[PDB]
Amino acid sequence: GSMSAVKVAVTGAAGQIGYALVPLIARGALLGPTTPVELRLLDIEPALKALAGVEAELEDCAFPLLDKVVVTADPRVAFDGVAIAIMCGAFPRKAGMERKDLLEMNARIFKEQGEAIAAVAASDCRVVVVGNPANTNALILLKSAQGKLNPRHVTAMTRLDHNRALSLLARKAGVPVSQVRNVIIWGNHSSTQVPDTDSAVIGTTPAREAIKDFVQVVRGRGAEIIQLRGLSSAMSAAKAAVDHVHDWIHGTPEGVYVSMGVYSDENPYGVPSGLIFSFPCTCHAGEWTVVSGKLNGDLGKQRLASTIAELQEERAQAGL
Amino acid sequence: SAVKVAVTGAAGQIGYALVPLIARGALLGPTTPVELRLLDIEPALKALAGVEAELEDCAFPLLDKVVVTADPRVAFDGVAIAIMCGAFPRKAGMERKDLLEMNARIFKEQGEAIAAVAASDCRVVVVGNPANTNALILLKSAQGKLNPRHVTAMTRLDHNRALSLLARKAGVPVSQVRNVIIWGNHSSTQVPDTDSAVIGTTPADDFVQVVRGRGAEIIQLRGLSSAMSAAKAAVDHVHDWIHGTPEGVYVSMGVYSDENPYGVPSGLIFSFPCTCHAGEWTVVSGKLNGDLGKQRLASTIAELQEERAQAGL
Ligand SMILES: NC(=O)c1ccc[n+]([C@@H]2O[C@H](COP(=O)([O-])OP(=O)(O)OC[C@H]3O[C@@H](n4cnc5c(N)ncnc54)[C@H](O)[C@@H]3O)[C@@H](O)[C@H]2O)c1
């Protein structure tokens, strides 16, 4: 019976993922083709004119579902009453930065935003972090809410890694990607991610059977986009963000799990608690559940050591 | 089989916004697979490979295949829909005649390629400017092998802008507004018209100048021309053409002017209010106020005739 537009925040909204993402949300791809939406667009204060330009183009689309757009540089305004927050706002890695430098630069963003979400968002707000380093930014956000944000409602996006893996597997097998499911991206959204096809299927057939460098191609793909395009991914990252949220809210298809960076307390794999860690997940009634049994014993667990160690190092680098 | 859809100018920003909408099903609906054939100039081939790579990385269930090329015959081979975003780049201080001549070279080659290898019922919309005249060049270049009712130019971005503006002026949701009309050329001589528009079921200073000036306002704010909203409009144009317009709704389309009910001259691509059914437009009659109404169109008619001559047609 609720008729109000659902309030959705997008941070980094003056950036290139934002540009690709906002028309998808406004057209109904996120919440459904008959669900009214209100967009709250956050970027930095020097980007306000740019944000006005995004708002103007959204107006010029004449989207029937787009009830209202707010543009702002104040997270307290952006997050006011929001149900969904897609966090693309993060400054770009500069030449000469180590991973630690990128973490330290973007950490402040997520401390400030976690505090704001806690202060003004809806109690049931669901967050996905896209901006890098994604898993650790998500952890920072959650910890900065001082217990006021449900830990099961803060996630990080590995869905672009996941979709890349689904597509690569489809290409290697010579089948339509629509038939391929249940690849897994374990761990960090970084070069330590563990792309895993051991449980993947084509229809219901184990993928290994339909195939007459996989890990390296998945890990290398973002760099390949930069080589070809001169810029990092945007279209495909927006698409993945929509997928991540859509599966979370509307549910995963029957027999299907998807990769999500989720809070690791009480996971069934023995991975250390207190991290945002990518696991295979089903979603139902707005909630993720980690699918158990998809690592091959202690051998399987040993496969995760490097990514666990990286995430623990990042957590320390974040002051957490 | 998948419907083969060509997009020219596919390495540009409209193309970047447009291709994921097509691939996700927005163009032809939720159960129609598509094959994307992406054309741009040969120096843009690496950029097109990046577009293809990102399309792959979307894992779109409806996207059966992607081909990238700089050869128009390759891009248009078997295609049923062609969305022409590529056009000659304008340069500050270029004469209109020169610009039209340079676009005529592009659109002549593309019309010849469409006639040579596209599907017999291929439908075309031209987005890239000058859109009406480029469309006309394409049609005329097709050696009589292309149905004149299947070549169009896009005024839908101007239309959607006018819907939005009227909604904002009335203080109502845009979903409640319909039947604005953009007559004529996709240019500063367009005639934005709210005389037939409806808010709900009720008949509806600066409206015209705001619509005409909106593209420049985007550039002032953005630093670049519209892209997201132009891609959205292109999808609307084609989707409404193929799927049909809802009962009581008409939309603006640049269409071939022979046999129009408004006495506008023949042999032009001219924006009119249209209903669509099953891949065919029909111009809606009676929406100008007699001869005084028809005089509203004189300037845009003259501009289109001037451009046709300067293009070498
Ligand atoms: N799979 C993934 O998780 C994935 C994929 C692609 C990109 N990324 C990351 O997503 C982020 C966005 O990528 P992009 O290409 O759109 O970058 P971009 O530089 O085009 O956009 C980032 C935007 O964030 C804004 N920003 C900076 N601080 C902010 C703050 N305090 N609040 C809100 N906005 C702020 C910037 O001003 C900028 O407009 C980057 O960190 C990028 O590395 C992640």
Secondary structure of A106-159 in HEC code, one letter for each residue:
HHHHHHHHHHHHHHHCCCCCEEEECCCCHHHHHHHHHHHCCCCCCHHHEEECCH
Of the residues A126, A156, A186, the one at which a domain ends: A156
When scoring A24, A219, A235 by the number of chain B Cβ atoms within 10 A, the one with the most, hence best to mutate, is A235
A17 annotated among ligand-binding-site residues: yes
Whether residues A218 and A277 share a domain: the answer is yes
Q: Which of B272, B308, B274, B240 shows the shortest CA–CA distance to B27?
A: B240
Secondary structure of A65-115 in HEC code, one letter for each residue:
CEEEEEEECCHHHHCCCCCEEEECCCCCCCCCCCHHHHHHHHHHHHHHHHH
Whether residues A272 and A131 share a domain: the answer is no
Q: Indicate the resolution in Å.
A: 1.5
Domain of B138?
1-153
CA dihedral B78, B84, B85, B86 (to 10 degrees): 90
Q: How far apart are CA A108 and CA A140, in angstroms?
A: 9
Whether residues B82 and B216 share a domain: the answer is no
Can you give the length of chain B in residues?
313
Q: Is the CB of A237 under 6 A from ligand 1?
A: yes
Residues 6+ apart with CB under 8 A from A136: A103, A107, A276, A311, A314, A315, A317, A318
Q: How far apart are CA A108 and CA B226, in angstroms?
A: 33
Catalytic residues of B: 186
Phi, psi torsion values for A102, nearest 5 degrees? -65, -40
Whether residues A132 and A189 share a domain: the answer is no
Of the residues B113, B133, B153, the one at which a domain ends: B153
Q: How far apart are CA B34 and CA B32, in angstroms?
A: 6
Q: How far apart are CA A256 and CA A56, in angstroms?
A: 39
Whether residues A284 and A171 share a domain: the answer is yes
List the beta bridge partners of residue A281. A258, A290
Written as one letter, the residue type at B153 is A
Whether residues B159 and B146 share a domain: the answer is no
| Residue A307 belongs to domain with CATH number | 3.90.110.10
Q: Is the CB of A261 under 6 A from ligand 1?
A: no
Secondary structure of chain B in HEC code, one letter for each residue:
CCEEEEEECCCCHHHHHHHHHHHCCCCCCCCCCEEEEEECCHHHHHHHHHHHHHHHHCCCCCEEEEEEECCHHHHHCCCCEEEECCCCCCCCCCCHHHHHHHHHHHHHHHHHHHHHHCCCCCEEEECCCCHHHHHHHHHHCCCCCCCHHHEEECCHHHHHHHHHHHHHHHCCCHHHEECCEEEECCCCCCEEECCCCEECCEECCCHHHHHHHHHHHHHHHHCCCCCHHHHHHHHHHHHHHHHCCCCCCCEEEEEECCCCCCCCCCCCEEEEEEEEECCEEEECCCCCCHHHHHHCCHHHHHHHHHHHHHCCC
Verify cis geometry, omega within 30 degrees of 0, for the bond prior to A133. Answer: yes
Q: Does B46 touch chain A (CB under 8 A)?
A: yes
H/E stretch holding A192 reads none
Whether residues B273 and B170 share a domain: the answer is yes
Whether residues A66 and A188 share a domain: the answer is no
Q: How far apart are CA A180 and CA A163, in angstroms?
A: 10
Q: Is the CB of A160 under 6 A from ligand 1?
A: yes
Verify cis geometry, omega within 30 degrees of 0, for the bond prior to B130. Answer: yes
| Beta strand A180-181 pairing with A154-156 | unpaired
| Residue B7 belongs to domain with CATH number | 3.40.50.720
Q: How far apart are CA A296 and CA A177, in angstroms?
A: 26
- The two tokens of residue B7 are 């997009």
Maximum pairwise Cα distance, chain B? 56
Written as one letter, the residue type at B217 is E
Of the residues B118, B153, B188, the one at which a domain ends: B153
Residues 6+ apart with CB under 8 A from B261: B283, B285, B286
Looking at the 3D structure of chain B, how many domains does it have? Answer: 2
